[PDB]
Ligand binder design. Structure first.
Ligand SMILES: [Zn+2]
Ligand SMILES: [Zn+2]
Ligand SMILES: [Zn+2]
Lengths: 366, 452, 50, 41, 66, 177
């Protein structure tokens, strides 16, 4: 009731500035990113199980937990389809001791984000059911092929995990069915989700803030490394070229579509069944082939020959290269970042840009 | 005031240059400053078309110009073509069949190509050799000089005891319609055009000075062409590098020292050979300084939903302006606290201000915490300001001439049709034969009545 | 490699013609002829006759 | 698989979820309550 | 016919019949309104239009006080 | 507010073969068309910005960044620094044999991070749209495809448009970009 005494003063002219700068510096933090030269699960049928519990309506977040969770899942679907194109998502809301396959396992963000914009309007009545949700996710994820790192992400809030049967035989089955389940938890640590996470192979985490929860979902965007158990197969792939209406439709093949459609003149075929698809990449609806344009293999090549660390040094320190090798600007701050191989000079803006978006050192290309 | 009230209309360099003599225009493009300055005023279509057709000696047919544009944009296309045509850029030629060729005015085209590439003139830059000059002036001190001189002129309009205007400028202010002298033992008042001049942007105020200054350029032996070439030579200059005067006539010397009185140019001495084009002179442009922030000065007025103005600026000028369109309560050495009362705005429109001046004034000086809002003003306050000015401006006046109580009905629509024919129809009736024609154009129909 | 290094080291010494060298007007007229809808680089494309 | 791949187990308050009333001796028609009593007792 | 060179007044009908009331009371010097040519428009003698410009707003503000 | 970033593929081997060809069109008219495009872009609006990069065989050195002959003044200073920078670049030069095919991935990387820092320079009132012109005249090496796609996807994310004028030969990676 006396927080007003948190503001001290020594000279009081820049001392209130020092207290405000200490507070504003203590109101921020940096992320923790991990590097690996290890095998990753790059075809990735992930399957999101959201709570629809009573505890979703609690107001620990700035809106209630349903709204914030659903907003960050909209961001999650966006960044996951932005970074892994082959993969798919399916969304289950778990509600009233039963599980509901809200959006089936598909690979385009339009249907999922449309369903989340719908699912803002829900009710969140009852206690969850981890049994039935893992059962529906298992039931769909039995028969995906063995090289797929089949992954479930349970955004789980409440504590009473109201199952209708025994949920250690599910964990033994899902251990044998080489699935991988990771739970992001709200407000607590629950022993059953801990056993599920450490036994199926996943990772369990509990949420402080908006920013920490964004860091956790960003941690689950990237393809997680594989165990010594998952099959390393060789999936047969198809690379259909784009085909416009051939020569002003001189002996074309006028089709409707293949999944309220208009008359398609041309587009993408299939090299297996010779059907008609508008969008690529799409799993072949009548063959079982997977269809790839092949920058969609190049969109996720940075995981395989990855980045390295920047040697971060704040001080002045021998810098005979005053200008940024990134964008030709002066280093007006005390943070200078130097690469490993070429050992050029980069600033903070070039650091965040290279390590988040461009994914390569501009020096090592030269 | 049996006409309408004095609405301060900025010409925006189109109604100025469109409406002159084409010989004046063909002399006007005889310096590359004027060609760049008319170039940047153009809309983006006409911009890209001039830069397309610049390197070309053949009159392209009309079909290609109409056929360079996608179909949906023809409504927003003919404005650029018509604006090029009326401004004597596109003079029309003929392909030897019937195709009406279009070609840029070779004075305009040659001097744009001088503005982009090497040239035969020298932009009237000169220096014999004078190095680091005796009392070289500093760039923030040029900013300070601009602020001092132009705020002295603004205080003179406001009517402070800082009246350092040297009475040629006061005669200019009386001649442009801003400070009316009445009962000639020296009260200089403010016209309502002066109040609307005050609430305007700084480049808009200076360009309105240059337009109403050259509106009466038939007085002192001045010519429009050389003065406008010197204005467009000023606003395409640099604060850092220094200039010289040798290469200017004596009427140019009188205009340049009158311009020194304006504060747009920092001299050192009257008989000197050097001028420093000030930061007011560079941002001389027919345009808008913004809707959230100004390059000149960052905004300083926080307008909260309490109808509450927080001005973070100490200046007697801007305090007087906020006194014009509001009423003021607290004054601290960093801040002024004012409230926008209904009665304050109804006082600000009794002296005559259409309240787009007020809303654009507050948008111009929007404090950088008031930014990061997409409606930078609270729309309750802004729509309340507009509703207050619509309560004050509810009468619309027109001088007319009456036709009433005709003996028939065929001559009724005959007089109405003759009014519509010569474009003098104002208001009509359907039932009781009560028509309004233009009174100045009435004598045509009146002598038609004496002819039938 | 050696021939081209010699010729381009000699080339980029004497430089900057801006008025004269850049465009002949007949090349610009033929370019406008090409980018007009019946010439080269206008492929008679985006037709899509349905 | 099934109606819900299983049913809703009796969480708690199977007598006090919508207690004695499908609106003491009020109406009794709630499906969760009758199925949870069928399992529980 | 009867050519009078008066002044057209455009308003909203509330102020139209306020002008009719104000002309019936003769508060600007004369019966300055000639006739009523619309549901909206009025005619007024040209030289009393400035005293109109002041006193109409002033008397509308005076009517909201008693 | 707009930002054109011209990238001129200054392969000294290719333009050397072009200047020993004794054609009409040499590197001088290429860099002069670059500067006339740059002065035209700065000329179309006051707020426009310009940056001109030259991919050499072993370095991505930028070219950019009173009135004596009648131009606008900042156009004169920009033309002087571009002329002096290409004269410092191409004349004072080197010779190596293992790496003689030109590069385009690094200059595009510098352009991407330059547009990033110049978008951090932008204040809250205005907003910057941006594009990268690529004037290509040589044959691109295949060996940097792993790199090259990456900068394209960066321009996919950063919403930077990419344009290309290829001069002699078609280029599949650049029409792909
Ligand atoms: Zn197929
Ligand atoms: Zn490196
Ligand atoms: Zn940098």
């Amino acid at each position: 009731x006396x927080x007003x005494x948190x503001x001290x003063x020594x000279x009081x002219x820049x001392x209130x500035x020092x207290x405000x700068x200490x507070x504003x510096x203590x109101x921020x933090x940096x992320x923790x990113x991990x590097x690996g030269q290890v095998r990753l699960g790059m075809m990735r049928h992930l399957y999101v199980v959201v709570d629809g519990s009573r505890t979703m309506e609690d107001q620990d977040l700035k809106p209630n937990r349903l709204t914030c969770t659903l907003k960050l899942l909209e961001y999650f679907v966006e960044e996951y389809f932005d970074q892994n194109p082959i993969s798919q998502i399916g969304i289950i809301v778990t509600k009233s001791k039963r599980a509901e396959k809200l959006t089936e396992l598909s690979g385009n963000p339009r249907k999922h984000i449309t369903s989340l914009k719908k699912a803002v309007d829900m009710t969140c009545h009852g206690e969850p059911s981890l049994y039935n949700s893992l059962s529906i996710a298992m039931q769909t994820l039995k028969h995906m092929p063995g090289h797929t790192s089949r992954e479930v992400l349970i955004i789980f809030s409440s504590l009473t995990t109201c199952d209708p049967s025994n949920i250690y035989d599910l964990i033994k089955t899902l251990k044998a069915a080489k699935i991988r389940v990771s739970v992001i938890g709200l407000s607590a640590e629950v022993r059953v989700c801990t056993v599920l996470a450490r036994e199926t192979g996943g990772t369990y985490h509990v949420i402080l803030d908006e920013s920490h929860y964004k860091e956790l979902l960003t941690h689950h965007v990237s393809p997680p490394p594989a165990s010594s158990s998952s099959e390393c197969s060789l999936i047969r792939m198809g690379f259909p070229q784009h085909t416009i209406x051939x020569x002003x439709x001189x002996x074309x093949x006028x089709x409707x579509x293949x999944x309220x459609x208009x008359x398609x003149x041309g587009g993408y075929f299939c090299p297996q069944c010779r059907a008609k698809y508008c969008e690529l990449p799409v799993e072949c609806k009548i063959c079982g082939l997977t269809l790839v344009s092949a920058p969609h293999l190049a969109r996720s090549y940075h995981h395989l020959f990855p980045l390295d660390a920047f040697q971060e040094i704040p001080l002045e320190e021998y810098n005979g290269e005053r200008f940024c090798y990134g964008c030709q600007g002066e280093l007006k701050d005390q943070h200078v970042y130097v690469c490993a191989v070429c050992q050029n000079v980069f600033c903070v803006d070039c650091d965040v840009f290279v390590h988040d978006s461009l994914h390569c050192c501009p020096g090592c290309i030269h | 005031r049996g006409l309408n009230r004095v609405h301060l209309q900025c010409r925006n360099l189109q109604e100025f240059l469109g409406g002159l003599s084409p010989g004046v225009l063909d002399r006007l493009y005889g310096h590359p400053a004027t060609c760049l300055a008319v170039f940047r005023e153009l809309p983006s279509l006409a911009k890209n078309w001039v830069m397309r057709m610049l390197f070309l000696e053949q009159p392209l047919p009309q079909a290609a110009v109409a056929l360079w544009v996608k179909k949906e944009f023809s409504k927003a296309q003919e404005e650029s073509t018509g604006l090029l045509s009326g401004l004597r850029i596109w003079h029309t030629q003929l392909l030897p069949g019937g195709l009406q060729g279009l070609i840029l005015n070779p004075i305009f085209r040659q001097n744009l190509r001088i503005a982009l590439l090497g040239g035969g003139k020298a932009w009237s830059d000169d220096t014999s050799q004078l190095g680091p000059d005796k009392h070289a002036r500093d760039v923030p001190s040029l900013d300070k000089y601009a602020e001092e001189r132009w705020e002295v002129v603004l205080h003179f309009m406001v009517g402070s005891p800082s009246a350092a205007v040297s009475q040629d400028l006061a005669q200019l202010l009386s001649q442009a319609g801003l400070m009316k002298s009445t009962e000639p033992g020296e009260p200089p008042c403010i016209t309502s055009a002066g109040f609307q001049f005050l609430l305007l942007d700084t480049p808009a105020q200076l360009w309105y000075f240059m337009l109403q200054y050259l509106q009466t350029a038939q007085s002192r032996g001045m010519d429009l062409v050389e003065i406008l070439s010197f204005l467009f030579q000023l606003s395409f200059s640099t604060l850092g590098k220094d200039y010289s005067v040798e290469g200017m006539s004596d009427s140019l010397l009188n205009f340049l020292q009158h311009l020194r009185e304006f504060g747009l140019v920092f001299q050192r001495k009257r008989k000197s050979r050097r001028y420093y084009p000030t930061r007011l002179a560079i941002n001389l442009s027919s345009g808008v300084s913004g809707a959230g922030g100004t390059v000149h000065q960052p905004g300083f007025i926080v307008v909260e939903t309490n109808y509450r103005l927080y001005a973070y600026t100490e200046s007697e000028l801007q305090i007087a302006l906020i006194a014009l369109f509001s009423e003021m309560l607290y004054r601290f050495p960093n801040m002024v606290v004012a409230q926008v009362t209904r009665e304050s705005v109804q006082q600000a429109i009794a002296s005559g201000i259409t309240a787009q001046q007020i809303i654009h004034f507050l948008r111009t000086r929007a404090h950088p915490v008031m930014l990061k809002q997409t409606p930078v003003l609270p729309p309750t306050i802004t729509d309340q300001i507009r509703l207050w000015e619509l309560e004050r401006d509810r009468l619309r006046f027109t001088e007319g001439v009456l036709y009433n109580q005709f003996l028939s009905q065929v001559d009724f629509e005959l007089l109405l049709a003759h009014a519509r024919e010569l474009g003098v129809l104002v208001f009509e009736n359907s039932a009781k034969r009560l028509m309004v024609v233009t009174p100045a154009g009435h004598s045509d129909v009146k002598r038609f009545w004496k002819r039938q | 490699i050696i021939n081209s290094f010699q010729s381009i080291r000699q080339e980029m010494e004497a430089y900057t013609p801006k008025l004269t060298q850049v465009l002949s007007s007949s090349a610009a007229s033929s370019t406008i002829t090409a980018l007009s809808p019946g010439g080269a680089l206008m492929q008679x494309x985006x037709x899509x006759x349905x | 698989x099934x109606x819900x791949x299983x049913x809703x187990x009796x969480x708690x308050x199977x007598x006090x979820x919508x207690x004695x009333x499908x609106x003491x001796x009020x109406x009794x028609x709630x499906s969760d309550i009758i199925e949870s009593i069928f399992r529980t007792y | 016919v009867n050519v009078l060179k008066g002044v057209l007044i455009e308003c909203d009908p509330a102020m139209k019949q306020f002008l009719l009331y104000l002309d019936e009371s003769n508060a600007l010097g004369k019966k300055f309104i000639i006739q009523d040519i619309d549901d909206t428009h009025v005619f007024v003698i040209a030289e009393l239009v400035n005293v109109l410009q002041e006193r109409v707003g002033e008397l509308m503000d005076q009517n909201a006080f008693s | 507010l707009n930002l054109l970033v011209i990238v001129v593929d200054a392969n000294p081997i290719w333009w050397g073969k072009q200047a020993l060809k004794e054609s009409q069109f040499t590197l001088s008219k290429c860099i002069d068309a670059v500067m006339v495009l740059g002065n035209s872009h700065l000329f179309m609006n006051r707020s426009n910005k310009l940056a001109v990069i030259a991919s050499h065989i072993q370095e991505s050195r930028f070219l950019y960044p009173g009135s004596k002959d009648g131009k606008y003044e900042l156009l004169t200073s920009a033309n002087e620094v571009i002329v002096e920078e290409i004269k410092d670049l191409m004349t004072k030069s080197d010779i190596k044999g293992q790496h003689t095919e030109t590069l385009l991935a690094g200059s595009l990387a510098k352009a991407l991070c330059y547009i990033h820092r110049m978008n951090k320079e932008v204040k809250d009132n205005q907003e910057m749209k941006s594009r990268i012109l690529v004037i290509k005249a040589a044959e691109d090496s295949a060996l940097q495809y792993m790199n090259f796609m990456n900068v394209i996807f960066a321009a996919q994310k950063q919403n930077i448009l990419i344009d290309a004028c290829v001069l002699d030969s078609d280029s599949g990676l650049l029409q792909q970009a």
